[PDB]
């Protein structure tokens, strides 16, 4: 038939990158044969680029109707349904296809993918493994399974797995195919900086293809601030305006911009989540736009053009909810990345990338497709100073006879409560109040031991640190500063009283075998020391425990605690002594949380930006001695902190002061420096100069 010849031509032209002039080929084939089952399928498959989301569904349904045994249509339709948010149906599409064709590997891969998205990681691993058995040469399932194993810290045959992934990327990079490793995942695998940037470029090119269908003309960009009253118009685009780590770091910056010279636009790709974070940004920002009601990217980008944004800030990168297609349209002259994606976009539409020397040294350049944007001290900023000001000062209880990490008390009204106490003693490190083991301490201890929610002492509210959720739900989330006094103790989390507490509250995926070995060596060299981790996920606990047993560490040497609300999670940091940063993916936000707690953090900067973070932090903090230059230096620094107690006290004191003295948590300072950089870039663009590294 003539339809078959048209079909084959269309497929070839599709591989030829001529989908624009190949979809027409598919169309002609369908016109020749209206009921061409195969032609209906593929034409929708190319439609999966974006086109009309339901347009693909129409062709897929017709293809399945014409040939009820077309398992390719079923699995593809399920994926198309996945983009449409119809999980209930996409799952049924995959299973429908699997039941028809049990040997269909792709359906098992997609079934595992949705399980993985839903969080049933073990089931995603199982289905992925079933897909690989059916089709071992299947990069997508392997990479996803490798990611799943990384998430649960399953390092069985780890090295070869890593090597296999690099080989897959090479082959897929040779053929210009879509790499199976997500650019966010690239930071977790040992790949050359070129490979990672190439993967980001390929993902960045994906949105370009889906925007060409609009054929939207170029966007006329302003060349002066005259139309804006000399005010630079900056639009912060993010889908995380709400209870998300991005908001917990920068919710204050929008309000801190100097309105005399700046006009702040907050474009939200997410609906209002009813959190005080969204409330704050919607109120303090000069303008807030819910692009979540503007699905069409062209429509949204056009709206950005109308507002007159001079600098557009991408706070998503290749994270969930990102709508980078809007940035592809170049709605603003200057476009730059900011917090949220710890990596390069590899895309032309991103002109700049905010960083700092330590985070992105000049030598580590060429790893970024974007021109570098220098931030005087650090690119990372935190709102802990505002979210948890009750942690600025703390108090302890003398259980035996100067322990600052066993029985700690926090509270805004702490000063008045202490003044009501008869025998308060002061230990100078400004200084730390200490409660002697008296009847008041006895009442507090009974509260903790009995697990009582709260007590009253001289009319003061005393809250058990583990029951903040039911005492004030808003406070536990960090939306509200607790209006009570909170008691936190090692006994709450089973930490040994007279023991060194090494901690790392990052997600377990940031842990790799070499990092675990380093920490194991630390524990062996430091007696009476324990490692404090989080069930995050909880399935990683057995894997970590087994690898410790193989490393010679008894079970009791590692203590696992469940994840806790933001306020409780940050409050627990005081209980520990030193935090061990994950060198593979330096704890970025978790590093801020621990530092606010006053807990020293030992880090080993790497080659990637994500690895180099938390070094910039420590640098800006003024605690350079906690940055290790190699594996041995990391081990030695951690071991000294655990053994030289006087050194630990001095370092913890320095962290305690620098967290407030150093311009690390000074949001107003950060905003002003950000405003400076903003201007610098504009001048460059005003004088016609194209993006060039700002340092």
């Amino acid at each position: 038939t003539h339809a078959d010849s048209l079909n084959n031509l269309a497929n070839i032209k599709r591989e030829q990158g001529n989908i624009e002039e190949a979809v027409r080929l598919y169309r002609k084939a369908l016109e020749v044969f209206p009921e061409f089952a195969a032609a209906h399928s593929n034409l929708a498959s190319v439609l999966q680029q974006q086109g009309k989301l339901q347009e693909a569904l129409m062709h897929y349904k017709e293809a399945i109707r014409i040939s009820p045994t077309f398992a390719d249509a079923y699995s593809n339709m399920g994926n198309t349904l996945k983009e449409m948010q119809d999980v209930q149906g996409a799952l049924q599409c995959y299973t429908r296809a699997i039941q028809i064709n049990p040997a269909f590997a792709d359906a098992h891969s997609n079934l595992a993918s949705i399980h993985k998205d839903s969080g049933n990681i073990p089931e995603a691993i199982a289905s992925y493994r079933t897909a690989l058995k059916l089709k071992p040469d299947f990069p997508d399932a392997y990479c996803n399974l490798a990611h799943c194993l990384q998430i649960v810290c399953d390092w069985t045959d780890y090295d070869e797995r890593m090597k296999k992934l690099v080989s897959i990327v090479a082959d897929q990079l040779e053929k210009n195919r879509l790499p199976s490793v997500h650019p966010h995942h690239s930071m977790l695998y040992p790949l050359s900086h070129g490979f990672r940037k190439a993967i980001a470029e390929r993902h960045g090119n994906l949105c370009l293809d889906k925007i060409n269908v609009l054929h939207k003309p170029p966007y006329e960009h302003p060349k002066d601030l005259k139309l804006s009253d000399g005010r630079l118009r900056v639009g912060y685009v993010s889908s995380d305006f709400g209870n998300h780590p991005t908001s917990h770091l920068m919710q204050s910056i929008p309000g801190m911009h100097n309105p005399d010279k700046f006009e702040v636009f907050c474009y939200a790709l997410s609906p209002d989540d009813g959190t005080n974070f969204r409330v704050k940004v919607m109120a303090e920002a000069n303008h807030f736009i819910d692009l979540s009601q503007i699905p069409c990217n062209g429509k949204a980008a056009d709206r950005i053009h109308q507002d007159g944004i001079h600098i557009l800030v991408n706070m998503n990168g290749y994270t969930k909810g990102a709508r980078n297609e809007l940035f592809a349209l170049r709605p603003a002259p200057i476009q730059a990345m900011w917090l949220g994606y710890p990596g390069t976009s590899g895309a032309l539409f991103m002109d700049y990338i905010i960083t700092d020397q330590e985070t992105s040294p000049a030598e580590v350049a060429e790893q970024y497709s974007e021109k570098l944007a220098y931030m005087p001290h650090t690119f990372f900023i935190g709102d802990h100073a505002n979210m948890f000001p009750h942690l600025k000062k703390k108090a302890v209880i003398d259980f035996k006879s100067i322990y600052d990490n066993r029985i700690v008390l926090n509270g805004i009204d702490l000063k008045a409560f202490l003044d009501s106490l008869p025998d308060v003693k002061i230990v100078k490190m400004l200084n730390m109040p200490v409660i002697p083991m008296n009847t008041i301490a006895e009442a507090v201890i009974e509260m903790i031991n009995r697990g009582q929610i709260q007590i009253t002492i001289n009319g003061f509210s005393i809250s058990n640190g583990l029951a903040t959720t039911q005492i004030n739900n808003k406070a536990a989330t960090g939306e509200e500063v607790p209006r009570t006094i909170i008691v936190t103790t090692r006994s709450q989390y089973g930490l040994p009283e007279d023991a060194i507490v090494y901690c790392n509250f990052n997600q377990l995926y940031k842990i790799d075998p070499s990092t675990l070995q380093m920490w194991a060596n630390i524990l062996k060299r430091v007696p009476n020391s324990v490692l404090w981790l989080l069930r995050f996920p909880a399935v990683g606990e057995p894997n970590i425990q087994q690898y410790a047993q193989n490393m010679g560490l008894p079970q009791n040497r590692i203590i696992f605690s469940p994840v806790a609300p933001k306020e409780e999670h940050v409050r627990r940091g005081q209980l520990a002594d030193v935090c061990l940063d994950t060198p593979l993916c330096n704890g970025h936000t978790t590093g801020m949380d621990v530092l606010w707690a006053g807990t020293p953090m030992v880090t080993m900067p790497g080659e990637t930006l994500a690895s180099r973070v938390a070094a910039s932090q420590l640098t800006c903090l003024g605690c350079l001695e906690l940055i290790a230059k190699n594996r041995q230096e990391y081990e030695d620094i951690a071991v000294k902190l655990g053994t030289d107690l006087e050194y630990l006290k001095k370092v913890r004191g320095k962290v305690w002061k620098q967290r407030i003295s150093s311009p690390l948590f000074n949001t107003k300072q950060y905003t002003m420096e950000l405003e400076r950089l903003y201007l610098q870039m504009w001048e460059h663009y005003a004088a016609g100069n194209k993006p060039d590294h700002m340092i």
């Binding site: 031991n449 697990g451 103790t489 006994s491 709450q492 089973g494």
Partner: peptide, 11 residues
């Protein structure tokens, strides 16, 4: 229930 992992001895 919902108490500390271990108790704290006290005279």
């Amino acid at each position: 229930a919902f108490s500390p992992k271990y108790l704290l001895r006290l005279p």
